[PDB]
Structure formats: structure tokens, C-alpha cells
Design an enzyme around this catalytic site. Structure first.
Site, short mmCIF file in Angstrom:
data_model
loop_
_atom_site.label_atom_id
_atom_site.label_comp_id
_atom_site.label_asym_id
_atom_site.label_seq_id
_atom_site.Cartn_x
_atom_site.Cartn_y
_atom_site.Cartn_z
N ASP A 84 -2.04 -9.90 -2.37
CA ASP A 84 -1.28 -8.51 -3.07
C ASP A 84 -2.20 -8.50 -4.41
O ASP A 84 -2.57 -9.34 -5.07
CB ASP A 84 0.30 -8.81 -2.99
CG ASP A 84 0.82 -7.35 -3.12
OD1 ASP A 84 0.31 -6.40 -3.41
OD2 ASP A 84 2.04 -7.41 -2.66
N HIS B 76 7.10 -5.64 -0.59
CA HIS B 76 5.82 -6.28 -0.42
C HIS B 76 5.79 -7.27 0.94
O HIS B 76 4.92 -7.08 1.58
CB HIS B 76 5.38 -7.10 -1.74
CG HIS B 76 5.16 -6.02 -3.03
ND1 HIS B 76 4.08 -5.62 -3.34
CD2 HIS B 76 6.09 -5.51 -3.55
CE1 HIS B 76 4.17 -5.14 -4.62
NE2 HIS B 76 5.46 -4.89 -4.60
#
Ligand SMILES: O=c1ccn([C@@H]2O[C@H](COP(=O)(O)OP(=O)(O)O)[C@@H](O)[C@H]2O)c(=O)[nH]1
EC number: 2.4.1.-
Length: 438
Positions: free
Chosen positions: A113, A14
Site C-alpha cells: 500500500d 485498505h
């Protein structure tokens, strides 16, 4: 200058994808605040060229700490899997520090996210628009949202069937799903996704209908790097035949079991391929050694064909080396995107979360093959060996190799126009929100 604060989930994959997006936004005259825990910021700092030092600024987020969960564990990278629930909980408890950061920096936009529903909630309370950026592909997200609207119907446009191993694999799962749903639904106007239309366009269109939001692809986002760690590996690869070697990696946050390693190892041995295999142990285990994780005598039998690297390897440099003919991969999405960009066919050994969906999409696009699990859900040494032999050693799967080269050509042709849509949607959103706040 328009400012954006970026908040990835605390995983290396990520962080990596968010950083590549940050670089692309910085070239469009955005100033980026890049926010994560210190242990994550230190891992990603080497990946940021000095050319960005003025436009991408790191901001430390603090999580609750205790001797038994200290700050150097505030990442999924090498985290003992049984600490994953604690990390999610500790991240949610950073929301007040996150609020104070947003108050102090007052960015014009938050990009967040899909594992932190508290982040768009905090942003909205501060009248800061917030857009969700997904570092997965589209297929898994559309597969997750489809049953919410069509609980009695088969997913359209795909013959993929999820193996019963993962269908079996209760409130932990539900709350993570509901958190993910919130992150998608809360996103302002659009969602961003690290994919591209040639691979997943029909799934983006379907996801857009399910969400009643525009799905904006911003992919391919792939990091590409004198290096001493690669030197030893490079020297070994330089002696191999072209397209003769597989890289074997299960990413940054998975540790295959002893039985899983046995099947992979015996699949590698039977195939007679050359291989470089990254073997890792969780943080806190610095007693364990390569030899104990592998079958007895495995490396002795492999001889010159095998190299095992402990801890971490230069994945992108290895995949780009002319000796590499294949990638035995857990099918994490960054690894898939990298393999496609570098033209390396994937031999998929997915383990959990989004990986079985990613492997199914890889198989569908024809840029790789998936080693299927047996009825009981176990990895099959015979399937691993057969796919390595067909794709790499004997090269009888020329369909796969040609499609992977074709995909690489497509991805290499993409330029900064891949970000045009995102930048226009950001501009519109901020101009609409400026009227609101007034
Ligand atoms: O030994 C390793 C293992 C992983 N990676 C990098 O770490 C990222 C892993 O991301 P991915 O989405 O594939 O899987 P995850 O770690 O999130 O499961 C990718 O960019 C890989 O290139 C690496 O450089 N060396």
C-alpha cells in the site's frame, strides 16, 4: 506456485480492498500471504470464505506496544484521530519484523500500500520485486502528482475545484505526501489501482505520463457477503416503500463533530426521508450513547422514519436492499465503488483526505451529487436536505438515478478478465527479475 505477500495499510478499507484482490489472485493460481496486525486480521477473517483457506494465509505483523498504545489499537478502525500519527510511526517500526517475515516466507512478489515506503525498501534489499496497489481512485492521485510537474498550471480535463476548506486543511502533511510519492515511484514497472476505465480512464492515462509507469486498473473490487445483525434492520427495511430510504455512514475511521452531526441530522429531518444512520464512538469510549451525539429530540421527531445503529452496520446488504434509494456517504472509495456496483446514487458529504476529490469525481460521472460546504467550510443542513429530497424523496434528479443504474449495469458485466492485465504484468515482471537475480 508463485507466492505473493500482500501488505495493506492498517485501515479497514485498505484491508478490504487488498483482500478482494487476494481472492482474485488466488483464483489465478497464486498463493497469497496476507500480512497485517492481529486486530486487523481478526476483523477481516469473516470476509474470507472457506473456499480460500488453502490459498490465502494470514501472517501476523507485530508493532511496538505499550499499555497506552496496546495491540488492539493497531488499526485505524475506530481509532481516536489523535492517535493516527502514533499508528503511522508504529507501523514504520515494524519494518524489521517485516524483513524477517519476508526472509522466512521468501515470496516471489510483494504487493504493498501507499503509506509504507519502508516496505518496498525492505523488499528491494531482499531482491523481492514489489508492486504498489492503491485502494483509492485515480483522480486524487493524479491531482496530487500534477503540481509536482506543473506547479503553475491548472489540472487538465476537469472542472473540479477543491473547496478552500480543504486547501487550508505542515511537515506532517509534507512527509505523508513524500512517503506516498516514494511508494508510487518505487513500484516495479506498474502500479495497480482499484478503479476502471469507464470512470477514470483519462486520469489513468495522465497519471501514467506523470509517473512514466503503466497504471493498471484492477477494479471494481467490491466485497459482497443467515445473519442476525442484519435481521432487525432487514425487518425494518422490509416495511418501507421501494427506493425510499438512505443509508448514512462516514466509514471506519472518521467521527463527525457535534456540529457536523447537527447539520446532518437536521438535513435528514427536513428531508422527511427514511434513514438508517451508523453512529460510532472511538475505541476506549464505551460510556457515550447515541442520544448524546444527536440533537435533543431528533429521534423522537423522526419517529418511524429513522433508525440509528451503534458501531457498525451491514453496509453492502443495506445498499442492496430494494428500499434503499440513496447513500449519504463520506465518499470513501470503497463506499463509492459499492454504491456504484449496487446502483445506489450517492449524496456526498466528504470529510477529509481523498474524500473531497472522490465526491468531485462522483459528481462529474453523474452517479451522485455533492452537498457543498458553505464559505466558512461548514456542512449545510439546507444542502443536505435539498439533495436528499431531490434524489430520493421526490426523485426529480432522474439524471442521477439513471446514470447510477447504468453504471451498475456496466460494473455487473465485468468478469475475471478485469484481472488479465495485472496478471500479465506480474508475469513479465517476475520473468525479467528472475534473469536479474541470476
Ligand atoms: O458501518 C459500516 C461502515 C463501513 N463499512 C464498510 O467499511 C468500508 C469502508 O471503506 P471506505 O473506503 O468507504 O471508507 P474508510 O473507512 O476507509 O474511510 C466499506 O467497505 C464499507 O462497506 C461497513 O460495512 N459498515
Amino acid at each position: 506456485t508463485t507466492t505473493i505477500l500482500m501488505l495493506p495499510w492498517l485501515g479497514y478499507g485498505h484491508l478490504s480492498a487488498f483482500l478482494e484482490l487476494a481472492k482474485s489472485l488466488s483464483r489465478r493460481n497464486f498463493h497469497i500471504y496476507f500480512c497485517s496486525t492481529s486486530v486487523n486480521l481478526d476483523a477481516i477473517k469473516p470476509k474470507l470464505p472457506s473456499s480460500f483457506s488453502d490459498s490465502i494465509q494470514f501472517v501476523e505483523l507485530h508493532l511496538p506496544s505499550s499499555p497506552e498504545f496496546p495491540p488492539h489499537l493497531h488499526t485505524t478502525n475506530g481509532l481516536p484521530p489523535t492517535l493516527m500519527p502514533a499508528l503511522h510511526q508504529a507501523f514504520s517500526m515494524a519494518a524489521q519484523h517485516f524483513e524477517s517475515i519476508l526472509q522466512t516466507l521468501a515470496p516471489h512478489l510483494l504487493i504493498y500500500d501507499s503509506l509504507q515506503p519502508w516496505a518496498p525498501r525492505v523488499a528491494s534489499s531482499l531482491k523481492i520485486p514489489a508492486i504498489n496497489f492503491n485502494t483509492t481512485g485515480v483522480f486524487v492521485i493524479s491531482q496530487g502528482l500534477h503540481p509536482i510537474h506543473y506547479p503553475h498550471s491548472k489540472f487538465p480535463f476537469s472542472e473540479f475545484v477543491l473547496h478552500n476548506h480543504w486547501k487550508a486543511m505542515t511537515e506532517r502533511t509534507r512527509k505523508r505526501g513524500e512517503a506516498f510519492l516514494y511508494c508510487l515511484h518505487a513500484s516495479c514497472s506498474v502500479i495497480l489501482i482499484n478503479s476502471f476505465r469507464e470512470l477514470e480512464g483519462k486520469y489513468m492515462d495522465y497519471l501514467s505520463v506523470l509517473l512514466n509507469k503503466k497504471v493498471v486498473p484492477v477494479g471494481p473490487l467490491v466485497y459482497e457477503p443467515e445473519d442476525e445483525g442484519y435481521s432487525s434492520i432487514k425487518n425494518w427495511l422490509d416495511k418501507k416503500e421501494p427506493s425510499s430510504t438512505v443509508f448514512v455512514s462516514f466509514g471506519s475511521e472518521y467521527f463527525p463533530s457535534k456540529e457536523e452531526m447537527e447539520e446532518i441530522a437536521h438535513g435528514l429531518e427536513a428531508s422527511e426521508v427514511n434513514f438508517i444512520w451508523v453512529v460510532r464512538f472511538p475505541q476506549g469510549d464505551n460510556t457515550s450513547g447515541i442520544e448524546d451525539a444527536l440533537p435533543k429530540g431528533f429521534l423522537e421527531r423522526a419517529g418511524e422514519r429513522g433508525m440509528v445503529v451503534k458501531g457498525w452496520a451491514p453496509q453492502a446488504k443495506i445498499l442492496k436492499h430494494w428500499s434503499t434509494g440513496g447513500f449519504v456517504s463520506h465518499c470513501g472509495w470503497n463506499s463509492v465503488m459499492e454504491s456504484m456496483m449496487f446502483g445506489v446514487p450517492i449524496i456526498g458529504v466528504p470529510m477529509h483526505v481523498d474524500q473531497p476529490f472522490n465526491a468531485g469525481l462522483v459528481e462529474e460521472a453523474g452517479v451522485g451529487v455533492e452537498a457543498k460546504r458553505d464559505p466558512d467550510g461548514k456542512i449545510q443542513r439546507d444542502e443536505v436536505a435539498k439533495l436528499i429530497k431531490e434524489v430520493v424523496v421526490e426523485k426529480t434528479r432522474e439524471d442521477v438515478r439513471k446514470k447510477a443504474r447504468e453504471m451498475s449495469e456496466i460494473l455487473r458485466s465485468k468478469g475475471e478478465e478485469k484481472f488479465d492485465e495485472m496478471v500479465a504484468e506480474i508475469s513479465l515482471l517476475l520473468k525479467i527479475e528472475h534473469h536479474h537475480h541470476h
